[PDB]
Amino acid sequence: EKKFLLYDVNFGEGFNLRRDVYMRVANTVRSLRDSGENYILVLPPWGREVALSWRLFFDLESLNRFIPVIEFEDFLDENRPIDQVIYLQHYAEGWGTEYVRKFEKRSCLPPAESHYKQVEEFKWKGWFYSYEDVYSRNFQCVSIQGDSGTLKDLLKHSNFSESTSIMVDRAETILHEHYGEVDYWKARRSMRYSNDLVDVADAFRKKYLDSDDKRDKTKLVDDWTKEKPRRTAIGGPYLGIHWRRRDFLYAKKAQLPTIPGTAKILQDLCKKLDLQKIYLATDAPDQEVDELKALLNGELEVYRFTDTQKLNDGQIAIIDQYLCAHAAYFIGSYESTFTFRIQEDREIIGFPISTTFNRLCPDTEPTCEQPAKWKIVYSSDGWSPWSEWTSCSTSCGNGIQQRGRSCDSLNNRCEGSSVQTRTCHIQEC
Ligand SMILES: Nc1nc2c(ncn2[C@@H]2O[C@H](COP(=O)(O)OP(=O)(O)O)[C@@H](O)[C@H]2O)c(=O)[nH]1
Ligand SMILES: *[C@@H]1O[C@H](CO)[C@@H](O)[C@H](O)[C@H]1NC(C)=O
């Protein structure tokens, strides 16, 4: 008995926050399947006016090794109705002294009812990834606190037993179960980039960066399930920088360097590491990149992927990430999920952690907070130290971060909390 899980996320969320939510939902599907449910994940079209296949960005065969996945267009070809939408929203009273995992159907909080409308008894209209003719047979809001496992529980609740296809909107509401542990990393590891994108990126490395997998020692097994831990990747003879600006300048100024600050940082790293080539991934306008270059030493060369051909903006972004990921040394931007996904690529490729978890400091704070070191994992008073805080659950609006610790109750009292939670807010949506 096939069942289908569809999802969407807050309209304002970017590509790389959406990549993280995929992992949350993919782990819900994993749990569902481990418990005997034949669930298939339907991949949501990439949109903000467009409705683009996952193939353009990712290797489906890789994704399919973790859980069964289909494109949304394939799902439509089966002529199956969407039986139920579950919207997903917070508990209006907010979380308490413990972060209780729970869910409950509740009246819809905004903007739910401005985004879905009952036009016939079994016809609820909504965005549905820009597809005008798609609709749901049923609709409701559910307040939820919890994780991939909690979502599993919700989807198995008797209230939805008659549905075969269910769409969970505002999926960013859900947290990772076991953040940074095996299954989190299996989901991350399965998101191999599309071969065509990897080919284009490798052509650039060869032609401009004196870089290929052979010399860089960055060759990865074709089948991600066979990856093993290593810290022996060298990378091409270049420095990678993700330079996040645009909106970050107008919601995030105090923790970013200026143009001269950035120049200084790059010059210093290049001297320390004997590198003369820099790969720059940035969203900044040409002028700003031009002013950066003009502040650098004449010996240093700055490269960017700009011969983009017929490639769409998301493909270009992936290419920038892959190129940063293969540098001898990487430095990224504060709280950017585009940067977070690069750090994860480096973990997978097998670089030393020193070369990966680095962030550009603001001009007046050279000992600024550096990113949390969530390292790749392949295997599964007496309190441990607290873990790092997780990345914010949301890239815009209010979200959640947590940190955890453990204690052996058999040989110690182990009093007090093993989890802390706090609100985070990266920028406005
Ligand atoms: N090509 C390219 N695009 C970028 C870069 N940095 C930001 N962007 C664009 O801006 C978006 C920012 O949203 P997201 O990926 O969620 O990352 P975040 O806002 O940095 O957390 C990215 O998806 C890209 O479309 C970059 O270095 N290269
Ligand atoms: C299931 O549906 C009924 C309304 O028909 C509702 O009372 C109940 O709260 C729902 N259960 C959950 C756990 O959301």
Curated annotation (Swiss-Prot):
- InterPro entries from the UniProt entry: GDP-Fuc_O-FucTrfase, OFUT2-like
Lineage of producing organism: Eukaryota, Metazoa, Ecdysozoa, Nematoda, Chromadorea
Chief subcellular location equals endoplasmic reticulum
According to the UniProt record, one GO cellular component term is:
endoplasmic reticulum
Put simply, this protein is called: GDP-fucose protein O-fucosyltransferase 2
Key words of the record:
Carbohydrate metabolism, Disulfide bond, Endoplasmic reticulum, Fucose metabolism, Glycoprotein, Glycosyltransferase, Golgi apparatus, Signal, Transferase
Intrachain S-S bonds:
108-141, 361-368
Give the residues the record marks as binding GDP-beta-L-fucose.
12-16, 242-244, 320, 337-338
Source organism per UniProt: Caenorhabditis elegans
